[PDB]
Hints:
By secondary structure, the protein is an alpha+beta fold. It has one domain. A 7-stranded mixed beta sheet has the order 2-1-7-10-9-11-12. The protein has a 6-stranded mixed beta sheet with strand order 5-6-8-13-14-15. Helix 3 packs parallel to helix 4. The protein is globular and about 55 Å long. It binds magnesium ion. The site of magnesium ion has 6 residues, from strand 10. This is Cytotoxic necrotizing factor.
Amino acid sequence: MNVAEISSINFRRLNSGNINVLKGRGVFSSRRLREIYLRFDAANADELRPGDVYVKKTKFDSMGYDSHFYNEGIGINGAPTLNTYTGEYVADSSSQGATYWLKYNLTNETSIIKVSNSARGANGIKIALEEIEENKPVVITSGTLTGCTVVFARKGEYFYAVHTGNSESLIGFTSTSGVAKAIEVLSSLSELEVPALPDVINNNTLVEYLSDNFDSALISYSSSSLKPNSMINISRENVSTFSYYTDDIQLPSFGTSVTILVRTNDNTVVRSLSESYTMNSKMVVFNVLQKDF
Ligand SMILES: [Mg+2]
């Protein structure tokens, strides 16, 4: 079959709420910015801007990048850290490591939201599940994960996606400051008072926070025994955790973490998938976790 026929099959699978349309097919991201039908709340918390979390309620449009959702340090001349596009071109050359999604697509009836980390902190979105429209499925991608942390979570009729980390090669940041920024964004988006946290905030803190304040969550993250704050040593029944990097799996391997939101049979399906890709000739899936919300 040709690219168009396969891509329409892909759309019909996605539109039935089938997460496996994204299973094994590698990472995807794009810098492209086209307005999609869905409005969501967006928030940014960054060490360079101490104080209130920045919040955006208006739709993402094509009429200029909001600097809170942009990183001048990405690429040769900057790149958005939060953008929306439609699925006729799923991955572009900005997607480090992309494979299948450079060739095939999800058609222009799919709406894609890319959420990256902030230069020194977290970006997040909150989606009202009852606003996902029939035959207009939505995909959230976090791009190529090489040390950052991605949270997907549900509370009531709302879904949250938060990506925290840094682009500045900072020692120890993501498992401490990155967690604090993610908690600030999650709290702002969910209208919760930012908790009085311990002086030491790390990935275990993130598990505890999500468990106590969200119905269900998935954390996809990097950890290593040489970096204790990165290691998760507690467990909570409503928080799944996926260490896409470990003591063995590191760069040039990479993680992926995606969600589909699909209105079908009068209900919004929400399904997430995290993978770890590593060299076998070929990048292979080393580990995977699929969680429904
Ligand atoms: Mg990072």
